Enzyme design. Structure first.
Site, PDB file in Angstrom:
ATOM      1  N   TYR A  45       4.713 -16.866  -2.147  1.00 51.40           N
ATOM      2  CA  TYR A  45       3.657 -16.987  -1.168  1.00 51.40           C
ATOM      3  C   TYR A  45       2.333 -17.310  -1.808  1.00 51.40           C
ATOM      4  O   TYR A  45       2.120 -17.102  -2.995  1.00 51.40           O
ATOM      5  CB  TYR A  45       3.516 -15.687  -0.374  1.00 51.40           C
ATOM      6  N   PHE A  55      -6.726 -15.736  -2.224  1.00 54.61           N
ATOM      7  CA  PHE A  55      -6.818 -14.381  -2.741  1.00 54.61           C
ATOM      8  C   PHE A  55      -5.571 -13.914  -3.474  1.00 54.61           C
ATOM      9  O   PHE A  55      -5.634 -12.898  -4.168  1.00 54.61           O
ATOM     10  CB  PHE A  55      -7.219 -13.384  -1.657  1.00 54.61           C
ATOM     11  N   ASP A  56      -4.451 -14.635  -3.359  1.00 52.15           N
ATOM     12  CA  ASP A  56      -3.243 -14.226  -4.038  1.00 52.15           C
ATOM     13  C   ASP A  56      -2.247 -15.368  -4.052  1.00 52.15           C
ATOM     14  O   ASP A  56      -2.261 -16.238  -3.187  1.00 52.15           O
ATOM     15  CB  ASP A  56      -2.641 -13.014  -3.312  1.00 52.15           C
ATOM     16  N   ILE A  75       2.207  -5.678   4.956  1.00 50.35           N
ATOM     17  CA  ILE A  75       1.481  -5.718   6.216  1.00 50.35           C
ATOM     18  C   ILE A  75       2.410  -6.072   7.373  1.00 50.35           C
ATOM     19  O   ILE A  75       3.452  -6.727   7.200  1.00 50.35           O
ATOM     20  CB  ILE A  75       0.269  -6.666   6.172  1.00 50.35           C
ATOM     21  N   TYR A 101      -4.947  -5.943   7.288  1.00 50.03           N
ATOM     22  CA  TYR A 101      -5.661  -4.820   6.671  1.00 50.03           C
ATOM     23  C   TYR A 101      -6.744  -4.201   7.553  1.00 50.03           C
ATOM     24  O   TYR A 101      -7.458  -3.294   7.124  1.00 50.03           O
ATOM     25  CB  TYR A 101      -6.217  -5.230   5.305  1.00 50.03           C
ATOM     26  N   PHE A 118      -1.201 -17.252   5.316  1.00 47.89           N
ATOM     27  CA  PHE A 118      -0.212 -17.311   4.265  1.00 47.89           C
ATOM     28  C   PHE A 118       0.688 -18.527   4.417  1.00 47.89           C
ATOM     29  O   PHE A 118       1.059 -18.918   5.534  1.00 47.89           O
ATOM     30  CB  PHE A 118       0.703 -16.086   4.280  1.00 47.89           C
TER      31      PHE A 118
HETATM   32  C1  LIG Z   1       1.339  -6.790  -4.182  1.00 48.51           C
HETATM   33  C2  LIG Z   1       0.897  -7.703  -3.235  1.00 48.51           C
HETATM   34  C3  LIG Z   1       1.266  -7.569  -1.753  1.00 48.51           C
HETATM   35  C4  LIG Z   1       0.554  -6.353  -1.156  1.00 48.51           C
HETATM   36  N1  LIG Z   1       1.086  -5.932   0.160  1.00 48.51           N
HETATM   37  C5  LIG Z   1       1.677  -4.587   0.246  1.00 48.51           C
HETATM   38  C6  LIG Z   1       0.629  -3.486   0.172  1.00 48.51           C
HETATM   39  O1  LIG Z   1      -0.182  -3.486   1.346  1.00 48.51           O
HETATM   40  C7  LIG Z   1       0.295  -2.860   2.470  1.00 48.51           C
HETATM   41  C8  LIG Z   1       1.603  -2.408   2.635  1.00 48.51           C
HETATM   42  C9  LIG Z   1       1.971  -1.781   3.823  1.00 48.51           C
HETATM   43  C10 LIG Z   1       1.063  -1.612   4.867  1.00 48.51           C
HETATM   44  O2  LIG Z   1       1.348  -1.013   6.066  1.00 48.51           O
HETATM   45  C11 LIG Z   1       2.706  -0.619   6.288  1.00 48.51           C
HETATM   46  C12 LIG Z   1      -0.233  -2.070   4.695  1.00 48.51           C
HETATM   47  O3  LIG Z   1      -1.097  -1.890   5.725  1.00 48.51           O
HETATM   48  C13 LIG Z   1      -2.481  -2.194   5.497  1.00 48.51           C
HETATM   49  C14 LIG Z   1      -0.606  -2.693   3.512  1.00 48.51           C
HETATM   50  C15 LIG Z   1       1.074  -6.720   1.242  1.00 48.51           C
HETATM   51  O4  LIG Z   1       1.539  -6.250   2.274  1.00 48.51           O
HETATM   52  C16 LIG Z   1       0.559  -8.133   1.348  1.00 48.51           C
HETATM   53  C17 LIG Z   1       1.728  -9.031   1.754  1.00 48.51           C
HETATM   54  C18 LIG Z   1       2.747  -9.089   0.632  1.00 48.51           C
HETATM   55  C19 LIG Z   1       2.111  -9.685  -0.609  1.00 48.51           C
HETATM   56  C20 LIG Z   1       0.869  -8.881  -1.040  1.00 48.51           C
HETATM   57  N2  LIG Z   1      -0.096  -8.552   0.064  1.00 48.51           N
HETATM   58  S1  LIG Z   1      -1.263  -9.623   0.264  1.00 48.51           S
HETATM   59  O5  LIG Z   1      -1.115 -10.913  -0.395  1.00 48.51           O
HETATM   60  O6  LIG Z   1      -2.021  -9.433   1.468  1.00 48.51           O
HETATM   61  C21 LIG Z   1      -2.425  -8.944  -0.868  1.00 48.51           C
HETATM   62  C22 LIG Z   1      -2.744  -9.589  -2.055  1.00 48.51           C
HETATM   63  C23 LIG Z   1      -3.665  -9.028  -2.943  1.00 48.51           C
HETATM   64 CL1  LIG Z   1      -4.061  -9.802  -4.437  1.00 48.51          CL
HETATM   65  C24 LIG Z   1      -4.278  -7.821  -2.627  1.00 48.51           C
HETATM   66  C25 LIG Z   1      -3.968  -7.180  -1.435  1.00 48.51           C
HETATM   67 CL2  LIG Z   1      -4.729  -5.692  -1.040  1.00 48.51          CL
HETATM   68  C26 LIG Z   1      -3.043  -7.737  -0.564  1.00 48.51           C
END
Ligand SMILES: CC[C@H]1CN(CCOc2ccc(OC)c(OC)c2)C(=O)[C@@H]2CCC[C@H]1N2S(=O)(=O)c1cc(Cl)cc(Cl)c1
Length: 128
Positions: A45, A55-56, A75, A101, A118
């Site tokens: 992704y 951002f990622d 998320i 978030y 995404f």
């Molecule tokens: C390790 C990266 C991962 C982080 N996560 C998991 C941690 O964040 C959560 C997990 C569960 C949640 O509710 C059940 C949650 O609610 C706010 C956040 C993501 O959900 C989402 C989607 C999967 C890919 C990433 N994020 S992301 O790209 O939004 C992301 C990237 C970066 Cl660099 C920082 C953040 Cl804080 C989030």
């Protein structure tokens, strides 16, 4: 660009029909099967903020992101969105903050009340 297009032309995939998660299938995947709850899913992704900044990216890490589907390990928009995907599919997902978030954001990169874009590729899914 792509974020505007999914905003304006995407499909609402929320059960509530609240337009909180919009989707466009960009590359059609294989057959008809989608993952089930609890499957180990492997994705690549990239994510962008509404100010245009990346951002990622898992591609930039040279390894996929792996999680168990439908367990809140990601998320809400991802649990909802990835569950709709076929193996080999690439989609675009536009995620309102209530499915991401929220008002908290996630420090340092995601502000409060952020709509996220995404591009996601479902590489594989397997039961354990
Ligand atoms: C390790 C990266 C991962 C982080 N996560 C998991 C941690 O964040 C959560 C997990 C569960 C949640 O509710 C059940 C949650 O609610 C706010 C956040 C993501 O959900 C989402 C989607 C999967 C890919 C990433 N994020 S992301 O790209 O939004 C992301 C990237 C970066 Cl660099 C920082 C953040 Cl804080 C989030």
């Amino acid at each position: 660009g792509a974020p505007a297009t999914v905003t304006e032309q995407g499909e609402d995939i929320t059960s509530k029909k609240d337009r909180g998660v919009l989707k466009i299938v960009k590359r059609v995947g294989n057959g008809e099967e989608t993952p089930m709850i609890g499957d180990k899913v492997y994705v690549h992704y990239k994510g962008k903020l509404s100010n245009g900044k990346k951002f990622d990216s898992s591609h930039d890490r040279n390894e996929p992101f792996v999680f168990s589907l439908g367990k809140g390990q990601v998320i809400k928009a991802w649990d909802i969105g990835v569950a709709t995907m076929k193996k080999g599919e690439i989609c675009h997902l536009l995620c309102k903050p209530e499915y991401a978030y929220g008002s908290a954001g996630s420090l340092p990169k995601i502000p409060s009340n952020a709509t996220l874009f995404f591009e996601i590729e479902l590489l594989d899914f397997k039961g354990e």
